[PDB]
Ligand SMILES: O=C([O-])c1ccc[nH]1
């Protein structure tokens with residue numbers, strides 16, 4: 150990657166994990182490329198359950214002093230599904246989910262830019278496996294770089310349309326719940342008094358935690374084909390969709406536990422929102438939808454095809470965005486460091 | 502274009518060290534060079550802001566020293582300031598310098614002289630098996646500027662505080678009866694209370710260093726619990742609030758220096774007597790007063806701060822010219838707003 154192979158003899162006793170730093174439309178998605186053995190498990194899903202329950206890797210790479218609550222880190226593993234060329238496990242600050250759009254884009258970009266999978270130009274096609282299923286990727290490549298990644302995400306669908314939700318201090322809200330590769334409660338920000346400007350980030354994150362907590366209590370979440378994913382991960386706070394020079398476009402702020410707004414438009418969020426829109430006849434197959442984030446970054450999306458999941462109408466959405474490499478690192482653990490799993494403090498890692 | 506960084510923390514507090522890829526800033530003193538870093542902001546934003554840094558990082562730039570006494574210089578980049586000195590960061594710098602081979606390592610002890618923007622510090626590193634395991638730093642002259650001054654703080658009435666310099670500037674206040682324990686899960690509350698006290702101290706008391714007019718504000722609020730003795734050794738805990746709202750994970754070497762100046766002014770500790778400073782996560786700096794001196798008309802001390810650092814990784818930071826955020830960004834969810 151235009152990087153030097155650095156070596157320091159005084160560090161020879163440290164365990165070492167090789168990471169490529171990346172963000173997609175502003176949202177960090179670092180990629181572990183070396184130093185970590187595939188977790189135990191016959192399925193990728195099972196491997197991800199190990200990562201979630203064991204916690205050792207998660208804490209090492211996500212906690213200060215090496216990570217920070219703004220990071221996500223993805224572990225590359227061999228594919229289990231014969232269709233796939235590479236598997237990956239997504240580690241978010243407080244969850245290990247079935248999918249993540251921005252992180253899948255980071256993974257695709259790191260894999261191709263570093264030569265882990267060979268690059269064709271102008272297009273590279275590959276199949277990756279996430280814990281929540283196989284995804285098909287088309288990378289637009291030029292000059293040895295993967296410039297834009299198009300991801301055919303897993304089946305997305307509505308679980309509740311216009312449900313009532315009681316939240317302390319806010320009375321009764323009307324919300325949707327849906328799956329886009331991860332689970333969402335979706336609510337209008339305008340009625341909550343927000344326009345989704347960047348200076349609102351902390352207030353939106355805290356408001357989002359509260360709404361997601363209420364939704365998990367009152368509504369829950371069921372994926373008809375995944376009995377293991379039974380909670381709402383995210384609160385997606387939206388402003389209404391408009392048409393700009395012919396193209397449908399909408400903004401949201403997605404609150405990630407324990408309290409951080411996605412800097413990207415949230416690929417799973419756009420997938421979920423597209424599922425609601427299609428259910429209400431607000432968009433059809435093929436039509437472009439531009440999702441925007443709190444910092445005005447963008448994903449270009451469309452519905453690729455329709456399908457069905459445990460008898461629910463579903464969509465296969467495409468999410469497209471760009472990622473950029475921010476660095477390469479070797480993470481080390483000195484056996485005498487008194488914080489081998491890092492630490493968490495409420496000043497920089499939101500409590501609760 | 503690639504910046505080479507050794508990641509380090511000293512007693513929990515991050516102090517990454519840039520060891521290659523960045524030319525020294527213009528200036529005829531290290532202070533002038535640090536002023537360029539502070540005003541230009543390009544390097545600071547790139548290494549401290551997300552997506553590469555985070556509000557919990559500090560990053561140090563090695564440069565050739567301007568002071569003839571020194572062998573290596575460094576510029577400390579903290580989240581909202583580029584200050585004269587930082588104890589934890591000087592320990593990370595010393596550790597990285599020796600572990601990387603930038604200055605040769607002798608065992609069992611290496612002696613070196615470094616230059617921070619606030620002046621020259623003398624370092625003795627305890628080295629074994631090719632590693633610098635413990636760093637002993639003779640910090641810059643430290644002194645009290647006000648003992649037991651009144652400070653009005655909204656919601657708290659009137660506090661009695663000290664202001665002092667330990668290589669950076671402090672308002673020092675007793676946490677007992679302020680209603681928080683010095684515990685990791687009170688970190689956010691303490692950081693916010695600290696910002697508020699520092700703001701009040703800057704408005705009502707201010708800070709002047711006799712030797713340099715640019716060191717003209719109070720950087721930190723040091724919230725203490727009373728001195729005790731543990732395992733026979735005088736010891737005290739503090740939580741230091743770093744702008745824009747983070748508690749030092751180390752005991753704060755400049756804060757220990759300032760507290761020692763107060764203690765000495767009050768006859769609570771003599772020259773050579775060990776004092777252990779403790780942090781919110783119970784990490785430790787072993788300190789003592791080495792000697793006495795005078796700064797302008799002020800009585801002052803030369804304190805030694807001792808701590809251990811550990812390498813967290815080695816990194817190469819890069820910037821893609823099409824990246825829309827070449828200076829990163831700051832958002833209030835993870836980077837506390839002013
Ligand atoms: O893009 C996404 O789906 C995502 C989830 C969390 C952060 N980004």
Ligand SMILES: O=C([O-])c1ccc[nH]1
Pocket residue numbers: 514586587588589590743749751752753754755756
């Ligand atoms: O050890 C210190 O002096 C320090 C200042 C800021 C963080 N640590």
